[PDB]
């Protein structure tokens, strides 16, 4: 039933809405995140592993957003490690 | 704070990139 491709896009898009709201004083942060996502292997972006990662990150972002940049860093790090280049 | 340093580190990486 689960389509990880669409689920990951949903989870990532939900996370970015939080980021947009809470990083408005540093406008370069959000495009950087999109850039990291843009450059990752699309199969990784559609993977169950990425889904699991996004679930944890978004969960932490929702319950404890005082460490948002921590979470942002995790996500950027993971995405860099799966860069298509 | 952990978040402060995380923020500082991310911003520097962006500026460097």
Author numbering:
A (entry chain A): 56 to 140
B (entry chain B): 1267 to 1283
Q: Can you quote the paper on this entry?
A:
The DAXX helical bundle (DHB) domain has been shown to interact with two modules of ATRX. The DAXX-ATRX interaction is a crucial link to bridge the chaperone-activity domain of DAXX and the remodeling-activity domain of ATRX together to deposit H3.3 into heterochromatin foci.
We determined the structure of the DAXXDHB–ATRXDBM complex at a resolution of 2.2 Å using single-wavelength anomalous dispersion with selenomethionine-substituted crystals. The final refined model covered DAXX residues 57–141 and ATRX residues 1,267–1,284. α3 is a short helix connecting α2 and α4, and it crosses the base of the helical bundle. ATRXDBM exists as a long amphipathic helix (residues 1,269–1,283) lying along the cleft between helices α2 and α5 of DAXXDHB. ATRXDBM binding does not induce large conformational change in DAXXDHB, because the DAXXDHB structure in the complex is almost identical to the previously determined NMR structure of apo DAXXDHB, with a root-main-square deviation (rmsd) value of 1.0 Å for 83 equivalent Cα pairs. Four nonpolar residues (A1272, L1276, L1277, and I1280) in the center of the ATRXDBM helix constitute a hydrophobic core that fits snugly into a shallow groove in DAXXDHB. Complementary with the hydrophobic contacts, a series of salt bridges and hydrogen-bonding interactions further strengthened the interactions between DAXXDHB and ATRXDBM.
